[PDB]
Amino acid sequence: GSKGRLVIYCSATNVMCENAAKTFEQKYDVKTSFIRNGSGSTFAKIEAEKNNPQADVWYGGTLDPQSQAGELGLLEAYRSPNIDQIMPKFQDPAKVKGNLSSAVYIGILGFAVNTERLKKLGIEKIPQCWNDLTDPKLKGEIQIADPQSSGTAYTAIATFAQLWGEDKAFDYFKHLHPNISQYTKSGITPARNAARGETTVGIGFLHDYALEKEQGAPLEMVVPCEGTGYELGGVSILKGARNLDNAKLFVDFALSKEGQETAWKKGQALQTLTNTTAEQSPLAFDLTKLKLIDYDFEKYGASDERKRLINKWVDEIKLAK
Ligand SMILES: O=P(O)(O)OC[C@H]1O[C@@H](O)[C@H](O)[C@@H](O)[C@@H]1O
Ligand SMILES: [Cl-]
Ligand SMILES: [Cl-]
């Protein structure tokens, strides 16, 4: 009873990806496989493969590189009927309109603190603001990912540019740098290392920290006092997808009540869902309760900002010097 196939480039966590693929395969009899890689890493792969695309759909990870892929003609437009159920402000959020990319979840940018480690290091108060993370007492005690690979890291750079302006954002990263022990390849690695007690502060998306906390890690999550940004998780069909009808079916599924709910019910992924008919995890953040910027996906999900800010970060924040 096999009904074709589907290849997914996934940029969410392995557990979320595997659950989505298995659930889709069992529901629709589509032989479904995925390859997981960072949001930025996946963008580069898709761009390199554009003359002979090797996947059908790009699922999860942050919207900005999917929006950039749309701008560059790497995607195939498709508006799912399930867009009707998506939070109106997020129905068609990318730079090029027409649902070349669609929003499947929301992740809040912030940081979390291993409180056992903070204590075991002699620091009395938990950082509450982005500003607090440049405190010299945190030298070598913070981790964040590298935006060459990680969507999360780019969401942070773009958030900081939107909060403070680009110049002061790069001032901030200059001051944050001495406190970073490791720039990680994956967005989620600071959460894992903070949970493990290998680092004291991780910067990333708070739902990853919430999952670690739910599993017993001594973490305190912080929505920084100045305000913060967020990812939209993206789903996009690749231009030249060999399995186009099945790709459209997967976009429908990813935007559906069932497909989104299964992320937190079975896929160990606690992002806030964009489908207004879906039940949220009790652990999901509620956007109406948070000090969030109006994150400009049209502006930051574009080559000018993504190439320019990432190359600027590489040049100044870690190379020289
Ligand atoms: O930063 P990246 O490696 O691109 O990954 C980004 C992804 O990271 C995960 O850990 C989060 O659960 C996802 O919500 C996010 O989309
Ligand atoms: Cl993973
Ligand atoms: Cl197909």
Side-chain angles (χ1 to χ4, degrees), residues 21-33:
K22 285 206 343 160
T23 294
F24 181 80
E25 174 154 348
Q26 60 190 26
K27 183 176 181 77
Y28 292 125
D29 312 293
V30 173
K31 180 202 104 226
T32 303
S33 57

Side-chain angles (χ1 to χ4, degrees), residues 129-171:
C129 299
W130 295 116
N131 185 62
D132 295 325
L133 302 185
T134 60
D135 181 345
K137 293 200 199 303
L138 294 172
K139 185 178 203 49
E141 286 298 335
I142 310 190
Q143 293 181 165
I144 191 170
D146 185 335
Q148 298 178 98
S149 45
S150 165
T152 309
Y154 179 73
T155 299
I157 298 169
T159 290
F160 298 152
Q162 288 173 90
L163 283 167
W164 303 311
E166 175 171 338
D167 289 337
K168 290 169 184 305
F170 277 99
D171 280 353

Side-chain angles (χ1 to χ4, degrees), residues 9 11-12 39 57-64 66-67 93 100-105 231-236 250 254-255:
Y9 279 168
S11 296
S39 313
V57 293
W58 182 2
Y59 179 56
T62 67
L63 184 66
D64 308 75
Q66 299 193 24
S67 179
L100 290 73
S101 304
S102 302
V104 293
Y105 57 70
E231 55 166 351
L232 296 169
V235 66
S236 302
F250 185 83
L255 294 163

Side-chain angles (χ1 to χ4, degrees), residues 112-119 121 140-143 181 188-202 209 212-213 216-220:
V113 180
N114 182 312
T115 50
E116 286 252 275
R117 190 158 171 88
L118 190 74
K119 188 153 325 208
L121 149 66
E141 286 298 335
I142 310 190
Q143 293 181 165
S181 61
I188 192 169
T189 296
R192 287 167 176 172
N193 290 161
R196 289 171 180 130
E198 300 250 343
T199 200
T200 307
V201 182
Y209 296 86
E212 290 289 349
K213 183 180 182 81
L219 294 175
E220 183 67 12

Side-chain angles (χ1 to χ4, degrees), residues 5 242-247:
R5 61 179 65 87
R242 289 192 298 273
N243 304 297
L244 183 56
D245 287 339
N246 283 166

